Amino acid sequence: KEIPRYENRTIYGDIDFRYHGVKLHLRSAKPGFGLRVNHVIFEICECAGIKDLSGKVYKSRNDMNIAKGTIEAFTKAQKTLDEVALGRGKKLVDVRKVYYSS
């Protein structure tokens, strides 16, 4: 599956996702932050192309259910800026990106 990536490095905002007994709390990170997450989540992020991420797993830490929950979270719990803008009829500006633009 294709997963949305903000700047092809991280997720859009923060994610609090519940997959069966696994409570996933994932936070987006600044460029160069690296992957600071559960080891199962780390491997998935490497394959998916996520470079910067922070997170913590609560309740169940079953490897199998963390991996599936993570995949589900990356698809069902994210919304691109473009999708948010079109749905609300509003312009969303990345302030950090504009600051370094012409």
Partner 1 sequence: SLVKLANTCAHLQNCSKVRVALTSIPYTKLQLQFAYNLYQQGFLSSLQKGSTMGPDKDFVEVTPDNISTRRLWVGLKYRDNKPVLSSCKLISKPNSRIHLPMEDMKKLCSGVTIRNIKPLQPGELILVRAHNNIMDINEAISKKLDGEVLCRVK
Partner 2 sequence: FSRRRIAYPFYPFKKLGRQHPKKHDTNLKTAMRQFLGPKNYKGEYVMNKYFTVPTNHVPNYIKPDLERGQSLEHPVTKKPLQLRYDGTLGPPPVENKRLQNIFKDRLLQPFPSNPHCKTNYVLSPQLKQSIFEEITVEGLSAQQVSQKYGLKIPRVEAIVKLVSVENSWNRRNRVSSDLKTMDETLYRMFPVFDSDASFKRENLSEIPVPQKTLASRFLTIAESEPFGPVDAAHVLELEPAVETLRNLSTVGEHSSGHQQSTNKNTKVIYGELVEGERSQYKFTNAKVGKVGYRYGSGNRDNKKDRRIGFNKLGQMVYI
Partner RNA sequence: UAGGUAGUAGGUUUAUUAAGAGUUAAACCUAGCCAACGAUCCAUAAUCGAUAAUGAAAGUUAGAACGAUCACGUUGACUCUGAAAUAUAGUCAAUAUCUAUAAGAUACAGCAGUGAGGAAUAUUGGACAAUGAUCGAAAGAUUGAUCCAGUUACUUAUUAGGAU
Partner RNA sequence: AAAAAUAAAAUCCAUAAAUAAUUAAAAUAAUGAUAUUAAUUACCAUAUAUUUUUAUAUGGAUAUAUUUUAAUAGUCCUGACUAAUAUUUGUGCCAGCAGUCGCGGUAACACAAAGAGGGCGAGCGUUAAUCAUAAUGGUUUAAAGGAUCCGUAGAAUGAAUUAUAUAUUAUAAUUUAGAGUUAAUAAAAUUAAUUAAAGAAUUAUAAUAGUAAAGAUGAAAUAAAUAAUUAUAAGACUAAUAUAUGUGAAAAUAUUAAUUAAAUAUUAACUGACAUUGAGGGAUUAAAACUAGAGUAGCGAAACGGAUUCGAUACCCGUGUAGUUCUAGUAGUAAACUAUGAAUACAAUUAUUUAUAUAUAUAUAUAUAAAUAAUAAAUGAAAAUGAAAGUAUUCCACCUGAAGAGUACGUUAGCAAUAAUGAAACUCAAAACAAUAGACGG
Partner RNA sequence: AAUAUGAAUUAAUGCGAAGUUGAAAUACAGUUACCGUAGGGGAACCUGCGGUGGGCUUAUAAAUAUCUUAAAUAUUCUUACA
Which residues contact partner 1 (rule: CB under 8 A)? 12-14, 79, 81, 83-90, 92
Chain positions 2 to 41 lying near RNA, rule: CB under 7 A, are 16, 18, 20-21, 23, 25
Q: What are the b/e assignments for 23-38, b being 16+ CB within 10 Å?
A: bbebbbbeeeeebebb
The correct pick among 7, 30, 58, 92 for binding RNA (CB under 7 A) is: 58
* 68 lies in the binding site for RNA (CB under 7 A): no
Contact between 75 and RNA by CB under 7 A: the answer reads no
17 and 5 Cβ atoms separated by less than 8 Å: no
Q: How many CB atoms lie within 10 A of CB 3?
A: 16
- Report which residue type is found at 3: I
Breaks (C-N over 2.5 A) in the chain follow: none
Where do contacts with RNA occur on this chain (CB under 7 A)?
16, 18, 20-21, 23, 25, 55-56, 58-61
Where do contacts with partner 2 occur on this chain (CB under 8 A)?
6, 28, 30-31, 81, 85, 88-96, 98-102
